[PDB]
Amino acid sequence: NWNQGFNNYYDQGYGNYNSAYGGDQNYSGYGGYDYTGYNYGNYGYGQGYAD
Amino acid sequence: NWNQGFNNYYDQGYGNYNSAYGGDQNYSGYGGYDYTGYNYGNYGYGQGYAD
Amino acid sequence: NWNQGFNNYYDQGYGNYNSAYGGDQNYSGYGGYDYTGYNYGNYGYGQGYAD
Amino acid sequence: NWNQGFNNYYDQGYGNYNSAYGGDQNYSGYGGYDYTGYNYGNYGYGQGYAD
Amino acid sequence: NWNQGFNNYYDQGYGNYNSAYGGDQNYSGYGGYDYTGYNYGNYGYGQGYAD
């Protein structure tokens, strides 16, 4: 028995679920508040940043 | 038994589900509030940023 | 019995769940507040930063 | 019996759960506040930083 | 009986849970505040820093 629900959210509270059943879950994004992010990663074929 | 529901949302509360059954789930986006994001990643064939 | 729910969120409180059932969960992103992040990692085939 | 919930969050308090059932959980990201991070790691095939 | 919850967070207090059920949990990231981090580690196949 694995439980992650039965949560109550008020005002501006939120909650996100990133799940992978029978696999591997990879997280590489951004979260939080009052931040600046720059994405240059390579996820397909080639290069992300060319200098 | 895996549970992630039975949640109550009030006012401006929200919740997102990113799931992958029989596979791998990859997260590379942005979340939160009061942030600035720039996306330059390469996801297909070629390059994301050309300098 | 594994429990992670039954949480109450008020005002601007939030909570995220990154889970992987029958697999490995990899975290490489950013979190917190008042930060600046630069992503140059290589996740596919090739190189992330080309100098 | 393993418990990690029944938490109360007020104002801007938050809490994240990175879990891996039947697997290994790897953490290599950033957390906290008032920090600057640079990601150059190699997670796929090739090299992260090319000098 | 293993307990890690029943915590109260006020203002900007937070708490993160990195767990691995039936496996090994590896931590190699950054935490705290007022710090600068550089990631060059190799996590896949190849090399992290090429000089």
Numbering used by the authors:
A (entry chain D), B (entry chain E), C (entry chain C), D (entry chain B), E (entry chain A): 345 to 395
What did the publication describing this PDB structure actually write?
Human heterogeneous ribonucleoprotein D-like (hnRNPDL) belongs to a class of conserved nuclear RNA-binding proteins (RBPs) that assemble with RNA to form ribonucleoproteins (RNPs). hnRNPDL acts as a transcriptional regulator and participates in the metabolism and biogenesis of mRNA1–4. Three isoforms of hnRNPDL are produced by alternative splicing (AS): hnRNPDL-1, hnRNPDL-2, and hnRNPDL-35. hnRNPDL-2 is a 301 residues protein and the predominant isoform in human tissues. A point mutation in hnRNPDL exon 6 causes autosomal dominant limb-girdle muscular dystrophy D3 (LGMD D3), a rare disease characterized by slowly progressive proximal muscle weakness. Here we present the cryo-electron microscopy (cryo-EM) structure of the fibrils formed by the full-length hnRNPDL-2 isoform at an overall resolution of 2.5 Å.
The fibril consists of a single protofilament where hnRNPDL-2 subunits stack along the fibril (Z) elongation axis. The fibril forms a left-handed helix with a full pitch of ~357 Å, a helical rise of 4.82 Å, and a helical turn of −4.86°, featuring a typical cross-β amyloid structure. A molecular model could be unambiguously built de novo for the fibrils core, spanning hnRNPDL-2 residues 226-276 and matching strikingly the region of exon 6 (residues 224-280), which is absent in the non-amyloidogenic hnRNPDL-3 isoform. The fibril core hosts six individual β-strands (β1 to β6) connected by β-turns and loops, yielding a sort of M-shaped fold, with approximate overall footprint of 55 Å x 40 Å. Accordingly, the filament amino acid composition is skewed towards Gly (27%) and Tyr (25%), which comprise >50% of the residues in the structure, and neutral-polar residues, with Asn, Gln, and Ser summing to 32%. Thus, each layer of the amyloid core is essentially stabilized through intra-subunit hydrogen bonds involving buried polar side chains, main-chain peptide groups, and ordered solvent molecules. Additionally, the Tyr aromatic side chains build ladders of π-π stacking interactions along the fibril elongation direction, stabilizing the inter-subunit association interface. Unlike most amyloid structures, the conformation of hnRNPDL-2 residues N226-D276 outlines pores that define two internal water channels. The major of such channels spans the fibril’s entire length and contains additional densities that correspond to two ordered water molecules per layer, that are H-bonded to nearby polar groups of Y239, N241, and with peptide N-atoms of G256. Apart from D259, the fibril core contains three additional exposed Asp residues, D236, D249, and D276, and no positively charged amino acid, which results in a calculated single-layer pI of 3.3 and a highly anionic patch extended along the fibrillar axis.
